[PDB]
Design a protein around this ligand. Sequence first.
Ligand SMILES: Nc1nc2c(ncn2[C@@H]2O[C@H](COP(=O)(O)OP(=O)(O)OP(=O)(O)O)[C@@H](O)[C@H]2O)c(=O)[nH]1
Ligand SMILES: Nc1nc2c(ncn2[C@@H]2O[C@H](COP(=O)(O)OP(=O)(O)O)[C@@H](O)[C@H]2O)c(=O)[nH]1
Ligand SMILES: Nc1nc2c(ncn2[C@@H]2O[C@H](COP(=O)(O)OP(=O)(O)O)[C@@H](O)[C@H]2O)c(=O)[nH]1
Ligand SMILES: [Mg+2]
Ligand SMILES: [Mg+2]
Lengths: 51, 34, 428, 426, 435, 54, 27
Amino acid sequence: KNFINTNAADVIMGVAKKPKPIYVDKRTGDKHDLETSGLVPKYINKKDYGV
Amino acid sequence: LWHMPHFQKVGPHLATFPTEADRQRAFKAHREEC
Amino acid sequence: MREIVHLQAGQCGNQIGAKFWEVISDEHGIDPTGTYHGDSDLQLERINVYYNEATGGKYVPRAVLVDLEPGTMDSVRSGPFGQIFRPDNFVFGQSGAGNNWAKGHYTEGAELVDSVLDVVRKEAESCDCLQGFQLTHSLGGGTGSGMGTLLISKIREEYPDRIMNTFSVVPSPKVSDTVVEPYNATLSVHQLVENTDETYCIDNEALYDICFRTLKLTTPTYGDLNHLVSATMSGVTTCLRFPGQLNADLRKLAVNMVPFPRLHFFMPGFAPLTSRGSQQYRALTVPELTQQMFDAKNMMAACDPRHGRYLTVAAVFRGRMSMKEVDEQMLNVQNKNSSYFVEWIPNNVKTAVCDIPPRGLKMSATFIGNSTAIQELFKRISEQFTAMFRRKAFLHWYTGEGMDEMEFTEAESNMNDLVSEYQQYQDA
Amino acid sequence: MREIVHLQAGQCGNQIGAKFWEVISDEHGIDPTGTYHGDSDLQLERINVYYNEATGGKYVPRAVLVDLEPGTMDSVRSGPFGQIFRPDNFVFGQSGAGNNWAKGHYTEGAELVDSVLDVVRKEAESCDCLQGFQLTHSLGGGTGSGMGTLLISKIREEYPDRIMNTFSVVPSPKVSDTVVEPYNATLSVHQLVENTDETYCIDNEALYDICFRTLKLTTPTYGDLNHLVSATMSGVTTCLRFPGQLNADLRKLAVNMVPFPRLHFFMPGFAPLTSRGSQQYRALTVPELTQQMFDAKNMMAACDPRHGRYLTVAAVFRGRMSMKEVDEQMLNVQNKNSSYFVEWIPNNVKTAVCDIPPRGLKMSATFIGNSTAIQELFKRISEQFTAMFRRKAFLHWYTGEGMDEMEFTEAESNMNDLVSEYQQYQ
Amino acid sequence: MRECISVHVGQAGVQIGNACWELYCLEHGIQPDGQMPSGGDDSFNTFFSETGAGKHVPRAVFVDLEPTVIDEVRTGTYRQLFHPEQLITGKEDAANNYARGHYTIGKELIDLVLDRIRKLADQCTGLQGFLIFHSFGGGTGSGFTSLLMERLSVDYGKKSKLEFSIYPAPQVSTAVVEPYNSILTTHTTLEHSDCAFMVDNEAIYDICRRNLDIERPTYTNLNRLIGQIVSSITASLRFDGALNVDLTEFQTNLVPYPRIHFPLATYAPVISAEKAYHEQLSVAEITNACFEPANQMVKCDPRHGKYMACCLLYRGDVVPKDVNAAIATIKTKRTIQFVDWCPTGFKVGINYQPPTVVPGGDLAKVQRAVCMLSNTTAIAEAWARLDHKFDLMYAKRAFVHWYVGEGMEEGEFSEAREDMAALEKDYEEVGMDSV
Amino acid sequence: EFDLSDPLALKKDRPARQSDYDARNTISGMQKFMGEDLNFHLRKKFQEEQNREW
Amino acid sequence: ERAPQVSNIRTLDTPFRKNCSFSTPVP
Ligand SMILES: Nc1nc2c(ncn2[C@@H]2O[C@H](COP(=O)(O)OP(=O)(O)OP(=O)(O)O)[C@@H](O)[C@H]2O)c(=O)[nH]1
Ligand SMILES: Nc1nc2c(ncn2[C@@H]2O[C@H](COP(=O)(O)OP(=O)(O)O)[C@@H](O)[C@H]2O)c(=O)[nH]1
Ligand SMILES: Nc1nc2c(ncn2[C@@H]2O[C@H](COP(=O)(O)OP(=O)(O)O)[C@@H](O)[C@H]2O)c(=O)[nH]1
Ligand SMILES: [Mg+2]
Ligand SMILES: [Mg+2]
């Protein structure tokens, strides 16, 4: 087995890990989950909205 | 130095010379002293 | 805010870690009762990376103590720094592993892994931003290799994004003290390969050759070997703890050490290391520091790096020094000696400096080297294992505990695949 | 700047350089613990040539110290200046060769040459610009003649452009202490002709001849013999370490004064050697030093300056003086005596000076000279070797170590051309 | 007015920013506690501000992802000068990854940094532009400085954005995966940058070894020399001068073509105290040292290429006639080649105020000084060598799993090298004479 | 200058062990070791004596 | 000679005796 091509095939035929949206608000740094916090529209596009 | 055979056919982004006839003439004339 | 949870299993792992916490407590200025009693603010500013906080100004380590035999549990606290650790973190079994990888992984470690993990989740989830994990053990014993690889699997499935380190004492090539350590080493490479970001291979006779030829001890014991190993662990994470001109933490060196996610086996090394009789003849400067640093005698892995090619090299420095002369002669070792560095990476060597040296030196540095020649450490265990599997030497101690010959056949196959990994990247 | 590596081999090489590191450390100013206590500033500026630096003011000697048995290096570590040498430079084997060239070059030299070349590489890369290597050893031995020739081969192959020096103790015919001394010498020379640039042939007969007929000393020891050897070994290289009106380095003293790549066997000599009863009756000027330096008595090889034409001569003077006195004395020894020099080299005189003399002496010089009359140093040592090999005398102590008689055969083929190559200039 | 906002990103930007902001305090008399021991002088407002109570706070923002580079500033001798909210740290570093600095960890602090720059820009009555200090080799020094400028182009548009970038030196280097970061941060900055003043550590090392009588220089010596350059750049608008040069004029007189904006900065009166006693420093004599290849602060021979544009900034008691006679002799000199399509070549600027030494530094008391910022064709071989570094690591796809495995497509590498491989012919085309 | 302490012959300084039993090497420094028995002779002659009347 | 620096030292005659004051679970 040739492993020069195998390591390159894993990189070329692959996808990037999508990072979780998280936001800071401090000079000292703090990782707050952006999705669960009420700063991004999450439940405004629900199927039960308006009706 | 080595820059792979794959990164040799890549084209430029700038066309500063006014025409294409002088583009080949400028490149041919300066290989004479080098 | 960049802390790491310390893990340690096995008698070798507990004794190495016990000496490791002595070196750390000295450098940060922590007395055996656990109160900061040093001489500078820059020993307490980043005390939270290893030590927790208890009321009364007391600093409790984040290490969790693991063993299957309770004999070493009494030895750790009865040591000169044994009251420092939390008694709840002393989690242990009641029956020994008996140099069996099957008992540490399947039989005896199964009931104990659920108990230690609660203590691990205890000390990892109280962290605002955990940097990673660090487990020290050996690959010759039962609970060091068996449960030391089971614990690696459970942490990586729980914390995949966090880094994981392994300070593994892979078994010694020529001198030995266990007849089944080829079995335990073969079964413990495959778990190390797939679930660890840094692995530092440490050999006992490499430490013995250092104790003999470099240090000239009259009678070295296990305390001296754990002394030299503790130099690396404190030296590797020196940028997490103290300021530097150009610092490089635990994860940043990992990025430019491993070109591919499987070739993560390094050779440690401590540079400023001198016998008593040659102390007055040696001047503590950087050019002599970097010449002992790359010497094969100083290497804490008993494999000669001239037999292979250096894939990636790094060396983090400690002490007030000048950056120019570090940069020019670490270029020189690549230039005057260009045959043992891989041609497909132009600069193979990473530099980093900390301002604060260890207490006991004006200036210090350590060595981390990813060389091809660590394949000769592994394929010799393979020929030392294939002499035993063909005749089924001590196989009934393993297949009678819930294993089969297929697991040995695959574990030989992944180990032979890694020896095939380094050979192609050497030839390329 | 211009650092040079010291190397020693054999018990004879260990005794000589221990005396040499005694007189250099006396010269630059160094106590038995290696601390400067001199009375000048010119003594520390070129201390890098022979000494490294350590914390506290220490100057460890730039020397690697190897022998095949550890008994003689116990005395070196217990000598008057044995505490300056770094203990890592001490390289010793378990069992010595024991006056066996084959054992020194093939059997026990094999597992010790890796250790010395590691130390040599470690200490040569510390030099900013390594001016070369220089070794002192004996040619009648097993360590100096067997392994020391092996060391020269490896450090020449690894370090091509640097110059190589050696101070070989050629075994003496009339006074001798080794039966197999022709074997250890004729197996060493034909290696040493093609791997060295300067080979100083110091002989024990001439060192003895100086001690009686010049020093008038009643009971010489090996300290009194190595003192004369250490005097010329410091005097050859004195412009490398001290300023002068006309400087001359080691390469300067080599490339100028060897005419062909085989004519590199040399004749040392130290001029101002005076008797204690005749010291106060002797003046110290340029003319008295010139006449006595070229005399056949003060020669340091057991072959007179006479059996052949002087190929080239080099004199490295020392002290505060005027050059025309040096020039007129060289002029007055060429015009009055023009029959002992080659006629195809017309300007055959080399001069070299330093403003700083040796301690306790106003004026001094070191004579170096190529002459044909060193061919008898090889003809006579081969006429007794070919009288010994022809009956296969001591061959089982050599052929059983992994060598054959063809290596012996090419030794005489280099003992009938090197003497021959000397003889076409007659 | 004439306000300027400085952004220091990465460990390099902070360490240079420490030496930049100590020098700006000594040029104005602002003490480390932010009090001027004196409406008098208002020359500080280009760098500093006011709070009414006599406190001067820098118009700078300090961003890093590793806390232990800014935490010295928070607990150092200048702990009361900088606003705490202007010093910004994260939790984890970029780990020498452009992907971490751009896509995952750099996207963290970018909204807070943009917020802080807006509060700084709201206090600016007249804003000359943005100065950004980073290193091509660092993780956040390449990633976050790339994400910032894309956001500055969205938010501030055509506002002048100048960079002080630490180039990877062609032979001496620190990191291994450093050539990967250099290609990536060059590709996404070409259309967003306006001009990029470039300097590397190896060429300063030789200048510190030779021109100054200091053996084994430190990073602290390098940052003061860079700090003297940025001071010499801005002090035309800080101080009274004969020829005023502004930050907007640098992009016009040094960037002829949109995709080439990499001039080279040098500071020629850098001489030791022992060596300043012997030689005179005249205007003609110090401006020839701007053109010596050994005195260039970028390790590349300008004789290998051709000069495209030069920006001479004179600082001190320089006479404009001696400035003029000096440039005329350089034009008559044949070993310096200028391109045919730039017959002018030279922009000169003169400031009256002498450089003030840092008390206890390496630089000598020069009465006059000159700082040269020149765009040369000779930087093309630096890209050619930098191509030899990235590519020789990319043919085996080495060190890409750290990049492709975190937020970044592999096709980024398959587009970011081809675009900067076009710079090789862009520098070729501007280096051919028209017949 | 500011930094100094690298150039101008400051190499004349502490060898990091002036002698035995100094209070500065401690255990974080890697110069003192437990394996070197400075009383190896004195323990031996105690044991040489101890085997005699045994 | 290096016994204090092995389990808990209580046995005076032989300091190399075992001392499971620990282990021995509270149940
Ligand atoms: N001239 C100069 N260059 C510096 C200095 N400090 C760091 N550098 C350069 O910066 C490069 C590394 O980038 P840094 O800014 O230090 O690190 P970083 O930007 O924080 O990158 P990460 O820590 O990986 O996120 C090195 O290769 C150095 O060449 C300095 O003080 N002066
Ligand atoms: N370096 C070092 N190695 C040790 C130490 N103690 C044990 N070892 C190694 O660990 C191996 C055996 O480990 P073992 O006692 O069976 O660990 P267990 O699994 O806890 O029983 C031996 O080959 C030793 O070389 C120590 O203090 N230092
Ligand atoms: N000039 C001189 N010759 C010596 C001295 N010591 C020994 N020799 C000579 O060295 C020869 C023996 O060399 P040997 O014992 O084999 O040394 P080795 O070759 O290093 O093993 C003897 O014939 C002596 O004449 C000395 O102090 N001075
Ligand atoms: Mg000369
Ligand atoms: Mg950083």
